[PDB]
Design an enzyme around this catalytic site. Structure first.
Site, PDB file in Angstrom:
ATOM      1  N   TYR A 194       0.819  -1.199   0.000  1.00 21.75           N
ATOM      2  CA  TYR A 194       0.000   0.000   0.000  1.00 21.75           C
ATOM      3  C   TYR A 194       0.854   1.250   0.000  1.00 21.75           C
ATOM      4  O   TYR A 194       2.027   1.255   0.417  1.00 21.75           O
ATOM      5  CB  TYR A 194      -0.922   0.024   1.220  1.00 21.75           C
ATOM      6  CG  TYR A 194      -0.225   0.299   2.527  1.00 21.75           C
ATOM      7  CD1 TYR A 194      -0.229   1.550   3.121  1.00 21.75           C
ATOM      8  CD2 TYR A 194       0.437  -0.721   3.195  1.00 21.75           C
ATOM      9  CE1 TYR A 194       0.419   1.767   4.328  1.00 21.75           C
ATOM     10  CE2 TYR A 194       1.060  -0.510   4.413  1.00 21.75           C
ATOM     11  CZ  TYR A 194       1.074   0.720   4.966  1.00 21.75           C
ATOM     12  OH  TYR A 194       1.722   0.888   6.179  1.00 21.75           O
ATOM     13  N   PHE A 199       2.125   9.671   3.504  1.00 15.35           N
ATOM     14  CA  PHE A 199       2.447   9.413   4.906  1.00 15.35           C
ATOM     15  C   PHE A 199       2.962   8.006   5.171  1.00 15.35           C
ATOM     16  O   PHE A 199       3.478   7.747   6.252  1.00 15.35           O
ATOM     17  CB  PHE A 199       1.280   9.756   5.837  1.00 15.35           C
ATOM     18  CG  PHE A 199       0.069   8.922   5.627  1.00 15.35           C
ATOM     19  CD1 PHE A 199      -0.061   7.695   6.254  1.00 15.35           C
ATOM     20  CD2 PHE A 199      -0.955   9.357   4.818  1.00 15.35           C
ATOM     21  CE1 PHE A 199      -1.192   6.914   6.038  1.00 15.35           C
ATOM     22  CE2 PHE A 199      -2.082   8.590   4.632  1.00 15.35           C
ATOM     23  CZ  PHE A 199      -2.196   7.376   5.236  1.00 15.35           C
ATOM     24  N   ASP A 200       2.821   7.087   4.222  1.00 16.17           N
ATOM     25  CA  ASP A 200       3.270   5.725   4.448  1.00 16.17           C
ATOM     26  C   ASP A 200       3.323   4.982   3.135  1.00 16.17           C
ATOM     27  O   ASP A 200       2.584   5.293   2.199  1.00 16.17           O
ATOM     28  CB  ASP A 200       2.295   5.028   5.402  1.00 16.17           C
ATOM     29  CG  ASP A 200       2.894   3.844   6.129  1.00 16.17           C
ATOM     30  OD1 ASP A 200       4.068   3.517   5.937  1.00 16.17           O
ATOM     31  OD2 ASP A 200       2.158   3.236   6.923  1.00 16.17           O
ATOM     32  N   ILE A 233      -7.503   0.242  10.538  1.00 20.06           N
ATOM     33  CA  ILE A 233      -8.652   1.142  10.479  1.00 20.06           C
ATOM     34  C   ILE A 233      -9.833   0.456   9.797  1.00 20.06           C
ATOM     35  O   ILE A 233      -9.687  -0.469   8.978  1.00 20.06           O
ATOM     36  CB  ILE A 233      -8.323   2.461   9.770  1.00 20.06           C
ATOM     37  CG1 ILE A 233      -7.831   2.237   8.339  1.00 20.06           C
ATOM     38  CG2 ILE A 233      -7.346   3.266  10.611  1.00 20.06           C
ATOM     39  CD1 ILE A 233      -7.645   3.533   7.594  1.00 20.06           C
ATOM     40  N   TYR A 278      -8.847   7.476  11.441  1.00 24.95           N
ATOM     41  CA  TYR A 278      -8.326   7.859  12.759  1.00 24.95           C
ATOM     42  C   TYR A 278      -9.161   8.923  13.461  1.00 24.95           C
ATOM     43  O   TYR A 278      -8.770   9.403  14.539  1.00 24.95           O
ATOM     44  CB  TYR A 278      -6.858   8.265  12.653  1.00 24.95           C
ATOM     45  CG  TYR A 278      -5.992   7.124  12.220  1.00 24.95           C
ATOM     46  CD1 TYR A 278      -5.494   6.209  13.129  1.00 24.95           C
ATOM     47  CD2 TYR A 278      -5.667   6.944  10.882  1.00 24.95           C
ATOM     48  CE1 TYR A 278      -4.706   5.131  12.701  1.00 24.95           C
ATOM     49  CE2 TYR A 278      -4.888   5.882  10.461  1.00 24.95           C
ATOM     50  CZ  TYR A 278      -4.418   4.989  11.369  1.00 24.95           C
ATOM     51  OH  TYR A 278      -3.631   3.937  10.973  1.00 24.95           O
ATOM     52  N   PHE A 338      -5.728   5.707  -0.083  1.00 24.22           N
ATOM     53  CA  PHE A 338      -4.814   4.577  -0.175  1.00 24.22           C
ATOM     54  C   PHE A 338      -4.885   3.953  -1.548  1.00 24.22           C
ATOM     55  O   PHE A 338      -5.970   3.841  -2.130  1.00 24.22           O
ATOM     56  CB  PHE A 338      -5.144   3.471   0.833  1.00 24.22           C
ATOM     57  CG  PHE A 338      -4.951   3.866   2.242  1.00 24.22           C
ATOM     58  CD1 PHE A 338      -3.731   3.700   2.869  1.00 24.22           C
ATOM     59  CD2 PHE A 338      -6.003   4.358   2.984  1.00 24.22           C
ATOM     60  CE1 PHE A 338      -3.560   4.039   4.202  1.00 24.22           C
ATOM     61  CE2 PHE A 338      -5.831   4.686   4.323  1.00 24.22           C
ATOM     62  CZ  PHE A 338      -4.621   4.516   4.924  1.00 24.22           C
TER      63      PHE A 338
HETATM   64  C1  LIG Z   1      -9.263  -0.864  15.123  1.00 26.27           C
HETATM   65  O1  LIG Z   1      -8.811   0.488  15.196  1.00 26.27           O
HETATM   66  C2  LIG Z   1      -7.540   0.644  14.721  1.00 26.27           C
HETATM   67  C3  LIG Z   1      -6.630  -0.392  14.526  1.00 26.27           C
HETATM   68  C4  LIG Z   1      -5.352  -0.123  14.036  1.00 26.27           C
HETATM   69  C5  LIG Z   1      -4.970   1.180  13.739  1.00 26.27           C
HETATM   70  O2  LIG Z   1      -3.723   1.483  13.248  1.00 26.27           O
HETATM   71  C6  LIG Z   1      -2.753   0.446  13.238  1.00 26.27           C
HETATM   72  C7  LIG Z   1      -2.894  -0.356  11.920  1.00 26.27           C
HETATM   73  N1  LIG Z   1      -2.616   0.441  10.690  1.00 26.27           N
HETATM   74  C8  LIG Z   1      -1.221   0.518  10.209  1.00 26.27           C
HETATM   75  C9  LIG Z   1      -1.188   1.307   8.907  1.00 26.27           C
HETATM   76  C10 LIG Z   1      -1.395   0.366   7.720  1.00 26.27           C
HETATM   77  C11 LIG Z   1      -2.790  -0.239   7.759  1.00 26.27           C
HETATM   78  C12 LIG Z   1      -3.691   0.918   7.644  1.00 26.27           C
HETATM   79  C13 LIG Z   1      -3.537   1.753   8.889  1.00 26.27           C
HETATM   80  C14 LIG Z   1      -3.677   0.969  10.034  1.00 26.27           C
HETATM   81  O3  LIG Z   1      -4.786   0.818  10.536  1.00 26.27           O
HETATM   82  N2  LIG Z   1      -2.203   2.356   9.006  1.00 26.27           N
HETATM   83  S1  LIG Z   1      -1.883   3.772   8.056  1.00 26.27           S
HETATM   84  O4  LIG Z   1      -1.211   3.439   6.727  1.00 26.27           O
HETATM   85  O5  LIG Z   1      -3.174   4.547   7.866  1.00 26.27           O
HETATM   86  C15 LIG Z   1      -0.701   4.691   9.060  1.00 26.27           C
HETATM   87  C16 LIG Z   1      -1.047   5.465  10.152  1.00 26.27           C
HETATM   88  C17 LIG Z   1      -0.047   6.119  10.862  1.00 26.27           C
HETATM   89  C18 LIG Z   1       1.237   6.010  10.523  1.00 26.27           C
HETATM   90  N3  LIG Z   1       2.301   6.587  11.121  1.00 26.27           N
HETATM   91  C19 LIG Z   1       3.465   6.282  10.544  1.00 26.27           C
HETATM   92  O6  LIG Z   1       4.566   6.688  10.913  1.00 26.27           O
HETATM   93  S2  LIG Z   1       3.221   5.316   9.306  1.00 26.27           S
HETATM   94  C20 LIG Z   1       1.569   5.248   9.469  1.00 26.27           C
HETATM   95  C21 LIG Z   1       0.638   4.607   8.761  1.00 26.27           C
HETATM   96  C22 LIG Z   1      -5.894   2.203  13.945  1.00 26.27           C
HETATM   97  C23 LIG Z   1      -7.164   1.939  14.432  1.00 26.27           C
HETATM   98  O7  LIG Z   1      -8.091   2.915  14.643  1.00 26.27           O
HETATM   99  C24 LIG Z   1      -7.859   3.560  15.900  1.00 26.27           C
END
Ligand SMILES: COc1ccc(OCCN2C[C@H]3CCC[C@@H](C2=O)N3S(=O)(=O)c2ccc3[nH]c(=O)sc3c2)cc1OC
Length: 128
Positions: free
Chosen positions: A45, A55-56, A75, A101, A118
């Site tokens: 992704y 951002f990622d 998410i 978020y 994404f």
């Molecule tokens: C159940 O509720 C949740 C569970 C897990 C959650 O986040 C952890 C899992 N997670 C990791 C990644 C990839 C999958 C997509 C998303 C993600 O969910 N992020 S993201 O690419 O958007 C993203 C965010 C910040 C960030 N900062 C960086 O330095 S790189 C980066 C990347 C959030 C939840 O909602 C509170």
């Protein structure tokens, strides 16, 4: 660009039909099967903010992102969106903050109330 296009031309894939998660299939994947709840899913992704900042990216890390589908390890937009994908599919997802978020954001990179874009490629899925 691609975020504008999914915003304006994407399909609502939410159960509520609240346009919280919009999708465009960019590359059609294989067959008809989509992953099931609890499957280990492997994706590549990239994510962008609505200000244009990347951002990622898993590509930049040279390894896929791996999670168990439908368990809130990601998410809400991802649990919903990846569940719609076939193996080998690439899609674009536009995620409103209620499916991402929220008001909290996620420091350091994701602000409060952020709509996220994404590109996701579903590499593989398997039951454990
Ligand atoms: C159940 O509720 C949740 C569970 C897990 C959650 O986040 C952890 C899992 N997670 C990791 C990644 C990839 C999958 C997509 C998303 C993600 O969910 N992020 S993201 O690419 O958007 C993203 C965010 C910040 C960030 N900062 C960086 O330095 S790189 C980066 C990347 C959030 C939840 O909602 C509170």
């Amino acid at each position: 660009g691609a975020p504008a296009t999914v915003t304006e031309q994407g399909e609502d894939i939410t159960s509520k039909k609240d346009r919280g998660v919009l999708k465009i299939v960019k590359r059609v994947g294989n067959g008809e099967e989509t992953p099931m709840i609890g499957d280990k899913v492997y994706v590549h992704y990239k994510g962008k903010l609505s200000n244009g900042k990347k951002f990622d990216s898993s590509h930049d890390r040279n390894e896929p992102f791996v999670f168990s589908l439908g368990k809130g390890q990601v998410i809400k937009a991802w649990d919903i969106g990846v569940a719609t994908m076939k193996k080998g599919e690439i899609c674009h997802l536009l995620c409103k903050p209620e499916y991402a978020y929220g008001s909290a954001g996620s420091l350091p990179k994701i602000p409060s109330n952020a709509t996220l874009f994404f590109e996701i490629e579903l590499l593989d899925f398997k039951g454990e």
